[PDB]
Design a protein around this nucleic acid. Structure first.
Lengths: 93, 50, 228
RNA sequence: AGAGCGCAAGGGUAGAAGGGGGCCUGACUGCGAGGCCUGCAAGCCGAGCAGGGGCGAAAGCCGGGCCUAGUGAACCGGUGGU
RNA sequence: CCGGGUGGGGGGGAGGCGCCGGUGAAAUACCACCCUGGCGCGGCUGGGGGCCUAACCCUCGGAUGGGGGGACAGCGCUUGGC
RNA sequence: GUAAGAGGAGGUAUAGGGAGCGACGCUUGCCCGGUGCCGGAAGGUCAAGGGGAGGGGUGCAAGCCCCGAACCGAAGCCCCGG
RNA sequence: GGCUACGUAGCUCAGUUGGUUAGAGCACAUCACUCAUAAUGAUGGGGUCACAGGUUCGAAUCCCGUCGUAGCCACCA
């Protein structure tokens, strides 16, 4: 889906692997000419740390788990109390 | 034609050129014979490359 | 016994991981040798030219800025006339084309043969089986290709060394001669590296220079940071 | 002149193109008038002039081949080089 | 390679070797590299076996948990292939 | 179906999916060359990756960037048989 | 093109980490044993280990050039 820390969502079409065939340097070029089209997904992961009294899951990006650990430490300082999963997880960030 | 091969001639003392042809079957090694340079005067010219 | 007792003293006269270059070896290894009285140096030079690499046994004939200190006599074979030339230099019975049979049997006062182009053929056909590979035959580049070869016989009384590769690069250059101070030792070392490059083959990769060892008659060697 | 004239054919050929030897490398570079041919683009003819040469005492011819087949615009890029 | 080599300690003692020669392509006390293949040890970086639990993935009368697998599996990027 | 999941199935190898012919009766031979297909801890070849010999360019220079060798590199095709 | 891997007698394959003293089975000729053929045995015909230098005193046993041959890749203005 989408990372709940720095957004991060999908990318298509001439996002890619393309095939191409491409060029470079074999003589006239690799084989020379070479060209075609494609598609590219992005990362994400799912990390579940409790924080405060209750439990919470996170649809975290790849290179951004320490960000939500930093969230654990940031939410410490505030007043978290009672039964509120995504609700307290919300005010967090 | 190829396999009988074609070659260019090159001077000495660095560069000077022309555009000729060869033949292998006759016991021929270093093709070497006279010509003229762009700069200066008469010189040999040695068989070379493609 | 073992490495000899002397060469335990010389087990400490090497500290088996040093260098001492051309210079510290010139002096400190003007000392380091201890045996008889020749201390050869044997510049023992190994690189990477391969036991063959198709064709690369080097050849290079060196004579140094001065001399080694030996004798060769040369014997020689030179159809009368050629003798004349070589016949003011070093010469032992130059003998037109007669001293090939007394080599082939009777008497053995020689080293090389100066040959000529002509008798190369001749002198290259007979005792060509041992003199070559062992290092004595004409081998038309080992002081044996004409009549400038009496002048090259003086290139011989100056030196000879035939740069080669065998299977180990090897080369073994012998001087120092017990009394060559630090000077002549340094000098002839540098010289041999010079000429080493002066007749070196190409086409092969690896690392030219390295195993340079200044290995004396019976003593120390452990490289010299093989160049400078 | 019916043979050879490299290989198909045709013209041509000894007052030589053929066949022998010596010498050599003009199977040059920079051009090139005026032409053949012609829808274009191609292809085909050549004195002459300068260089600097090869042959011959010369006179002289030599910018391949007796002549017409042996070939491939351009774009792409390799190549040694200014 | 059955030809003998190398290496270690006990004993006893001034003898033990080496060289053109003699023998073959090549000599054999002896100082130095390297090849060869093998042992070992340090750098660099993969192979393959086995255990472990808490990421991860299922599962159990409300699980705070226990139970099974477990860094494999699934997912993101990427490599080449069918 | 992009997923979550849906069916399969609240089924569990006497079961579920696919293919060929088609009640019952007599019977189903011979060839693995090509091809598909089952298999194999060697190998040929090949990708990114890894490693870094040798080197280039540039600047007083320290340095920065670029090229890439030995060997290490999977499936795939070939290879060995069924 | 890069890469490898073979290419030896008519047929068919060894030996191939040198070193001698280059082959074996089938094919063919002479004989032999045989009551007679087959089987086996004992000789002989043919290598020019594909082609040339380089290493070895001495490579069919290595490097390299050259094609002929197959697998893979991948270059086809």
């Amino acid at each position: 889906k989408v990372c709940e820390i720095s957004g991060k969502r999908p990318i298509v079409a001439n996002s890619i692997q393309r095939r191409g065939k491409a060029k470079r340097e074999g003589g006239v070029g690799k084989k020379t000419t070479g060209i075609s089209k494609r598609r590219q997904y992005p990362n994400l992961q799912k990390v579940r740390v409790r924080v405060a009294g209750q439990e919470i899951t996170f649809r975290v990006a790849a290179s951004h788990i320490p960000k939500v650990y930093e969230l654990v430490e940031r939410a410490k300082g505030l007043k978290l109390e009672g039964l509120s999963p995504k609700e307290i997880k919300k005010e967090l960030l | 034609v190829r396999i009988k091969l074609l070659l260019e001639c090159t001077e000495c003392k660095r560069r000077n050129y022309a555009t000729e042809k060869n033949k292998r079957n006759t016991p021929n090694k270093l093709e070497l014979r006279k010509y003229c340079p762009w700069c200066r005067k008469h010189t040999v010219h040695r068989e070379v490359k493609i | 016994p073992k490495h000899g007792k002397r060469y335990r003293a010389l087990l400490e006269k090497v500290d088996p991981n040093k260098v001492y270059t051309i210079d510290e070896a010139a002096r400190l290894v003007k000392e380091l040798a201890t045996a008889k009285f020749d201390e050869t140096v044997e510049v023992h030079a190994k690189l990477g030219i391969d036991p063959r690499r198709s064709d690369q046994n080097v050849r290079g004939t060196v004579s140094l800025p001065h001399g080694l200190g030996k004798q060769v006599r040369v014997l020689a074979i030179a159809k009368g006339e050629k003798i004349k030339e070589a016949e003011e230099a070093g010469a032992d019975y130059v003998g037109g084309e007669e001293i090939i049979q007394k080599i082939l049997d009777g008497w053995m006062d020689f080293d090389a043969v100066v040959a000529t182009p002509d008798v190369m053929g001749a002198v290259g056909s007979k005792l060509g089986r041992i003199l070559g590979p062992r290092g004595l035959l004409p081998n038309p580049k080992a002081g044996t290709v004409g009549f400038n070869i009496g002048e090259i016989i003086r290139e011989i009384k100056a030196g000879r060394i035939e740069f080669r590769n065998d299977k180990t690069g090897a080369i073994h250059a012998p001087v120092g001669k017990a009394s060559f101070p630090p000077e002549k030792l340094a000098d002839n070392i540098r010289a041999f590296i010079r000429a080493l490059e002066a007749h070196k083959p190409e086409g092969a990769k690896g690392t030219f220079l390295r195993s340079v060892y200044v290995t004396t008659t019976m003593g120390p060697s452990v490289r010299i940071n093989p160049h400078s």
